[PDB]
Structures are given as structure tokens and as C-alpha cells.
């Protein structure tokens, strides 16, 4: 599975 | 950055005239991702050529595999035409059996 942690913007 | 694609033209199995096979054209080490690749039989582009999904290496350079069902003979010449913004002209790499 891909990273389930949700992405903080750059 | 802009990196020139390497090209290898080859078959999936050892080529034998009459026996069906797969014609591969592996392009790698390039950037950016936009690239056009065509398989050529006797100078004409082959329709229904499939390509693997876009991925890249540790140095962020992309690689792709273009392939199609083909039948090697003794007269037919095969090649792979590659055009990329890094290239001045489209590179045509003939299949060296």
C-alpha cells in the first residue's frame, strides 16, 4: 500500500 | 536539468525467422518525461505499440519500454525512432541482430 499519511504542503 | 535518452533495440527472445517474438526499444536516463517513441518496420511506423508505465531511477532520470508483437524475417528491417527535446534530431536506432 502507498503512504496513507496525508501530505503536508510544500 | 535535461538528460539525453539512451536507446537499446532488441527482441524479447532470441530471434528466429518465422517464429513470432516481441520487439523491444528501451529508452532510459532521460529528463523530462515528454518523449515520443515509435517502432519502425522497413521505415514505416508500427501501429499498436504498447509502453510500460512511467518510472524513474535513483538519479531521477526516467525510463520506458516500448514493445509490440512482431515476426522477424530475413528481409524486414526493424528500428526504433526516438525524439526528445535534448536531441537535435530524432534518433533512429536500427535493430542489430
Amino acid at each position: 500500500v502507498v503512504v496513507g499519511a496525508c501530505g503536508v504542503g510544500k | 536539468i535535461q538528460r539525453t535518452p539512451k536507446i537499446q533495440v532488441y527482441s524479447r527472445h532470441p530471434a528466429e525467422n518465422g517464429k513470432s517474438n516481441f520487439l523491444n526499444c528501451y529508452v532510459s536516463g532521460f529528463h523530462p518525461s515528454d518523449i515520443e517513441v515509435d517502432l519502425l518496420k522497413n521505415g514505416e511506423r508500427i501501429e499498436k505499440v504498447e509502453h510500460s508505465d512511467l518510472s524513474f531511477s535513483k538519479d531521477w532520470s526516467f525510463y520506458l519500454l516500448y514493445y509490440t508483437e512482431f515476426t522477424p524475417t530475413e528481409k524486414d528491417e526493424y528500428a526504433c525512432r526516438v525524439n526528445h527535446v535534448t536531441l537535435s534530431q530524432p534518433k533512429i536506432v536500427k535493430w542489430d541482430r
Binding site: 502507498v2 496513507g4 501530505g7 503536508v8 504542503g9 510544500k10 | 528501451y26 518525461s33 531521477w60
Partner: protein, 275 residues
């Protein structure tokens, strides 16, 4: 042996031709098993290997949800980074993301990865301690303290040491007929005369998996890396890989040379000579 799972994201901004193109691929070792092409008609994570097809619809729904949500974040980051470098709105730009975990034969955490790039060059990467960040330029340091303030490292580390490794274990067992198989290289040698004082010997290695392999030439039991040629290991299109190595040798002395093939699918390293 040891195994890896990797995910590669690529988002390419195409001004004047719609929204950025997003492509995601999932790998176990040298085998792709999932893919997401936002230009494809399904808009869902699709299987690319037989063994992952058995996963239920709750798996494919969550995987579709998570990575398309990543593509939405990539869209905003594309505009953010372009502002970081004060770049025009009509130039094309690419964000690439790589991450994954490594496991040992016993099947638990060895290393974790998370690296991001912009226009083909390093942007920011997660260090090996999975607690600090390494930025390439000052624009990436703006992202660094952003991810430091939001504590992205803690939740990246949580996935790298947890859900990544756990599902890598499941994939390795559910598809062991493909992933854990070691097809040894079917090898042979070819001879092509160049002149009447020089000749080329090519050492072929075909149909092997995984891609890791070592082809070396020797002359009279001594290593020879002068006048040699190695090509990149290439996919055969059926899951296996190919590679060859060449050496230019004087005529008549062809049998002084030996090719050596090392591969994890071989009990002993092979040695081939032109008779």
C-alpha cells in the same frame, strides 16, 4: 533474501493543456504491481501483477483515494515551487517522489526512504534516521521548516516502519511464485570478427530475475576492464531481464578470455569460454 517496496510519483505540469499529469507506479523489488495514470479512463489504482488481483474492493478503493489525494497535493506544490523560483506559468515542470522500505530475510525493518525532486534534481529528502530532513537549496528549506513544524517526519517514519513493511510481507508471500522466485540467467557467448587482428566476444545473460547481476571479463585468469563494454540491464518485457558484456581481443587469443556471471539465482558463479 532481502526485499524492497518502492513507489514512484511523477506530476508534470502542462500549461494550456489541462491540469498536471500524474503517474504513480508501485514496485516490489524489480516487479511492478500497481499503477495510477490520471490520463487513463479508470481513475483508479489498477493491478499490474497477478497476485495483487486477489485484493478486495476495500483495498483498491483506499489505494485509489490515497494516491489521487497525493496528486491533488502535487498540483498545489507545483504552483508553490514555481513561486519559490519565480518561474513562468507557461513553462513545464516536474515533481518526482520516491519512497519505500527495505526488509531482511526475516522480514522486518531495515531501511526507509522518502525523497522529493523538482525538475530532475534533489529538492528535499528524509534522512536515514527518519527524523531529520536534508534540503538542497534555500527554496527547499522553506519546505523543510514547513515539514518540521507540521512534523511530517514522524508520520512518514510511522508508515515506513509500519504499514510499508507489513504489506511488503503480505505481497512477498501472496506472490512468492513470482516475487521470491530466482530465475538464473540463461547465458551464452557470441564471436564477431572485427578485422584479422581483432575480434569481439559478447557475453550474453538472458531471462534472469531479479535484475541484479554481475558480468565480468578475464584474460588468463586476470581481470580485464580495458576495451570492455557493458550495457545497462534491460527489461525483456516478460518480467525477466537481459544484459551483455563485450571485449575486443586479438585474433587467435579468444580462448584466453573467460566471462564470469554472478547472480543470486545461481549456486556457483558461472564461467564461459569460447571453444
Amino acid at each position: 533474501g532481502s526485499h524492497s517496496m518502492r513507489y514512484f510519483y511523477t506530476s508534470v505540469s502542462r500549461p494550456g493543456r489541462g491540469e498536471p499529469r500524474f503517474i504513480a507506479v508501485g514496485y516490489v523489488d524489480d516487479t511492478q504491481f500497481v499503477r495510477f495514470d490520471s490520463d487513463a479512463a479508470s481513475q483508479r489504482m489498477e493491478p499490474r501483477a497477478p497476485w495483487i488481483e486477489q485484493e478486495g474492493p476495500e483495498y483498491w478503493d483506499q489505494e485509489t483515494r490515497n494516491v489521487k489525494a497525493q496528486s491533488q497535493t502535487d498540483r498545489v506544490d507545483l504552483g508553490t515551487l514555481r513561486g519559490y523560483y519565480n518561474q513562468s506559468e507557461d513553462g513545464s515542470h516536474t515533481i518526482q517522489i520516491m519512497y519505500g522500505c527495505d526488509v531482511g530475510p526475516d522480514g522486518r525493518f531495515l531501511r526507509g526512504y522518502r525523497q522529493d525532486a523538482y525538475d530532475g534534481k534533489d529538492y528535499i529528502a528524509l534522512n536515514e534516521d527518519l527524523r531529520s530532513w536534508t534540503a538542497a537549496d534555500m527554496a527547499a528549506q522553506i519546505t523543510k521548516r514547513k515539514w518540521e513544524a507540521a512534523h511530517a517526519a514522524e508520520q512518514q517514519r510511522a508508515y515506513l516502519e509500519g504499514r510499508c513493511v507489513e504489506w511488503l510481507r503480505r505481497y512477498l508471500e501472496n506472490g512468492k511464485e513470482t516475487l521470491q522466485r530466482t530465475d538464473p540467467p540463461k547465458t551464452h557467448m557470441t564471436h564477431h570478427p572485427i578485422s584479422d587482428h581483432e575480434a569481439t566476444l559478447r557475453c550474453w545473460a538472458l531471462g534472469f530475475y531479479p535484475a541484479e547481476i554481475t558480468l565480468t571479463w578475464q584474460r588468463d585468469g586476470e581481470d580485464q576492464t580495458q576495451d570492455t563494454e557493458l550495457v545497462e540491464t534491460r527489461p525483456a518485457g516478460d518480467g525477466t531481464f537481459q544484459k551483455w558484456a563485450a571485449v575486443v581481443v586479438p585474433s587467435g587469443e579468444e580462448q584466453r578470455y573467460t566471462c564470469h556471471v554472478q547472480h543470486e539465482g545461481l549456486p556457483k558463479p558461472l564461467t564461459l569460454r569460447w571453444e
